Design a binder for these strands. Structure first.
Lengths: 141, 218, 180, 82, 104
RNA sequence: UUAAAUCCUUUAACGAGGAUCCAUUGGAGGGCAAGUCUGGUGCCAGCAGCCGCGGUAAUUCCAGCUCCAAUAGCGUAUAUUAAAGUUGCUGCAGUUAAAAAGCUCGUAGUUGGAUCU
């Protein structure tokens, strides 16, 4: 069992330190290779330039063609497939426009129906998609 | 109309047994729901903890019947927990109450600190261990209420426990086994021994004994 | 550096369980019974009572002969009595644990002006408090969360400048009387 | 069980097993209570009075009830020495 | 109680001149009247302030008894393969923790 | 008021019918309070944090109506904390679910029979 002496503190804490790495969450947060491989670079939102639009096929049970947009991040030049959130919102987005992109909400997991997309477009040309969808804004170019 | 089959039910039918506590002193089996219905009256409040459905796999196919976990409780008194399977739901519920009154147990109410007034909490931290579910009941000071999951919260409102701490272990998501575990703990209140009950007991007669002359006539 | 104070306290706690019918029922019943604007007034009163009870409970773990046990015990008793909740016969530290939420909402200026009947209805009472027509002693109070003391309860008036008070009739009356 | 004022704040006092002083529970339905008779020491006549033994369910289950009754009857002298 | 081969206690019956006494012949008719529980409540429009009444007898919005009866009535509009029982004849206060599981 | 202004506090006059001097943000399968309401699309568009809905009556889309929650605030993403007794000193596990080295010796380490008022 567990060592239960009174002069055994360094063994207990060294054992704890070595066994904290096998926790994948603590290793992901503290070893920090997922922090460098993150396209956002530990950022809540990123800003890119639209490169093309791709219709990606969904999972096998739910058949749909989700209209993702391939953008190039201004920061480090990584290619991002970001899902345009709502229906009819693919119409507003246009090639070579400055775009603000956020994740879906599983902290780095392809959420649900779409393999390879864990990002969603929030803003285009410094106006939101929610304003354009609800008839609140006029899009500049 | 209430019809007696036990001799205990015959004694309860007349005014020979004053309260429910002559049964519990002697651990006599309460085999009729309507004994419990007689002694407590309308004080027994209850709400169904869950109706979980199990589809019975049969020779013809799959046809479902429903299992009712109901919790009946006399406040600052007694609790019972009933589990009943039936074709309907309301039939399963009524079977669950009539089965839960058979499972009425008295819980012990004690004190945390100094002993002033009516008892309020579990007298000593007990445990209920049912099918990988482990419910610990810890005494608590006045007015803190019961800190627990909703279903043991229900059973501890019904127990008359005003305030206690609760710890759970295992798969809690099985509601029925969780409720059976905490029910086992509040039964283990009298299954536990305290230094208060260290005096040598004096043995009274079992209700069958001094009242057998009336059972000769029946 | 600046000559400023950044001491600020959140005076309410959001409940952990967001949608349960029991909590929503008790909160809405209490709101309707003493006429509050939203749930945050209930949550504020709940948090104040929780702090008082937790202080009392953290006092009870000390010895009976502990000096600060006695000192802040007497202080807590005196404050809870002068605010108008406890009574002089109930000066014991364990009786604060026998307090509930509405015992703190009965001392609001809204409920006090309703119970003393100087206004008509409890929503009318809240309106009359915020509409600047009701004063305490000599100071005009326009805030319905004003927790009225026991000794200051016995004199609440109509704020003499008000039309319900001494005089100076309002805008609507002076417009109506200058019609013809 | 009893507050500082002195009132017996308890629902009832449960009986204890005579063999091992354990509290016999409410739903311990395997427990027993012997009434055992003693005799007049001159003629072997029933007196009408009786001694009492209570045994919990576990003692009866493991097979130790009869030896417990025998040794408590030796203690009470209802069964003779040796 | 229900057996075909049955016993008759006729010889132990002592006296029965007038068997059809008017004590067991009570005419129980409550269907077409307004005393049957199996009748709609004629629902009131939803209050905006969220409660009915004032003082101590303020009947609130959900009001667990009322909400339980409402959830029972919402069970009454389930799938035909579902079996309910007699949930209106016996006062069934069923909660959302249970009703939502049954609805699922 | 103030260095002089501002803002707050005080005073005169004007200033109030909701069809306003008009309150938003999310949601209504479960988790989780709220609809088996109506019309359209028809595994398309989409919703969807999880399970899943949509393949011609959609309890989940799109609109409208109604309802709920919080309310001058309310969603969203990220990071982190509690729930986590899923890092375990308190306090986890190791036959079969992840797991005890093939076995033995052995240094450092860790712990070490009674016994003296």
């Amino acid at each position: 069992g567990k060592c239960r002496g009174l002069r055994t503190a360094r063994k207990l804490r060294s054992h704890r330190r070595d066994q904290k790495w096998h926790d994948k969450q603590y290793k992901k947060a503290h070893l920090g290779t997922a922090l460098k491989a993150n396209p956002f670079g530990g950022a809540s939102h990123a800003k890119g330039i639209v490169l093309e639009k791709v219709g990606v096929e969904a999972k096998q049970p739910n058949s749909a063609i989700r209209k993702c947009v391939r953008v190039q991040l201004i920061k480090n030049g990584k290619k991002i497939t970001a899902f345009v959130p709502n229906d009819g919102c693919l119409n507003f987005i246009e090639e070579n426009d400055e775009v603000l992109v956020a994740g879906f909400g599983r902290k780095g997991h392809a959420v649900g129906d779409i393999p390879g997309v864990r990002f969603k477009v929030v803003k285009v040309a410094n106006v939101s998609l929610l304003a354009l969808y609800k008839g609140k804004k006029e899009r500049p170019r | 109309e209430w019809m007696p089959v036990t001799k205990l039910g015959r004694l309860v039918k007349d005014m020979k047994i004053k309260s429910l506590e002559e049964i519990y002193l002697f651990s006599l089996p309460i085999k009729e729901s309507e004994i419990i219905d007689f002694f407590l009256g309308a004080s027994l409040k209850d709400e169904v903890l869950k109706i979980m459905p199990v589809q019975k796999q049969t020779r013809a196919g799959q046809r479902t019947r429903f299992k009712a976990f109901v919790a009946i409780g006399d406040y600052n008194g007694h609790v019972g927990l009933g589990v009943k399977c039936s074709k309907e739901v309301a039939t399963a519920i009524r079977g669950a109450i009539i089965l839960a009154k058979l499972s009425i147990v008295p819980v012990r109410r004690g004190y945390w600190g100094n002993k002033i007034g009516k008892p309020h909490t579990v007298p000593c931290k007990v445990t209920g261990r049912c099918g990988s579910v482990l419910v610990r009941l810890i005494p608590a000071p006045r007015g803190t209420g019961i800190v627990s999951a909703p279903v043991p919260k229900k059973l501890l409102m019904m127990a008359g426990i005003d305030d206690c701490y609760t710890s759970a272990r295992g798969c809690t998501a099985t509601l029925g086994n969780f409720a059976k575990a905490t029910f086992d703990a509040i039964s283990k209140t009298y299954s536990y021994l305290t230094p208060d009950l260290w005096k040598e007991t004096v043995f009274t007669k079992s209700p069958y004994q001094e009242f057998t002359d009336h059972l000769v006539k029946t | 550096p600046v000559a400023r104070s950044w001491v600020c306290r959140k005076t309410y706690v959001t409940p952990r369980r967001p949608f349960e019918k029991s909590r929503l029922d008790q909160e809405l019943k209490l709101i309707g019974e003493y006429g509050l604007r939203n749930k945050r007034e209930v949550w504020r009163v709940k948090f104040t009572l929780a702090k008082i009870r937790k202080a009392a409970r953290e006092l009870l773990t000390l010895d009976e002969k502990d000096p600060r046990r006695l000192f802040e015990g007497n202080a807590l008793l005196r404050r809870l009595v002068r605010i108008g909740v406890l009574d002089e016969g109930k000066m014991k530290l364990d009786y604060i644990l026998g307090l509930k939420i509405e015992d703190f909402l009965e001392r609001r200026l809204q409920t006090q002006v309703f119970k003393l009947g100087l206004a008509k209805s409890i929503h009318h009472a809240r309106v009359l408090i915020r509409q600047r027509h009701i004063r305490v002693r000599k100071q005009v109070v326009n805030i319905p969360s004003f927790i009225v003391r026991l000794d200051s309860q016995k004199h609440i008036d109509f704020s003499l400048r008000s039309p319900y008070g001494g005089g100076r009739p309002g805008r609507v009356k002076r417009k109506n009387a200058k019609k013809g | 069980m009893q507050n500082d004022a002195g009132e017996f704040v308890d629902l009832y006092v449960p009986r204890k097993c005579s063999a091992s002083n354990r509290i016999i529970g409410a739903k311990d339905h395997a427990s027993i209570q012997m009434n055992v008779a003693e005799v007049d020491k001159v003629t072997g006549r029933f007196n009408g009075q009786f001694k009492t033994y209570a045994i919990c369910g576990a003692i009866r289950r493991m097979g130790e009830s009869d030896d417990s009754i025998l040794r408590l009857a030796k203690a009470d002298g209802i069964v003779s020495k040796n | 109680g229900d057996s075909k081969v049955s016993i008759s206690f006729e010889n132990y019956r002592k006296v029965h001149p007038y068997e059809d006494s008017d004590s067991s012949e009570d005419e129980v008719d409550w269907q077409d009247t307004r005393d049957d529980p199996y009748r709609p409540a004629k629902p009131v429009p939803t209050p905006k302030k969220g409660f009915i009444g004032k003082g101590k007898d303020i009947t609130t919005k959900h009001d667990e008894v009322v909400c339980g009866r409402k959830n029972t009535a919402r069970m009454e509009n389930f799938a035909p393969e579902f079996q309910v029982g007699d949930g209106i004849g016996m006062d069934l206060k069923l909660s959302n923790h249970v009703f939502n599981a049954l609805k699922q």
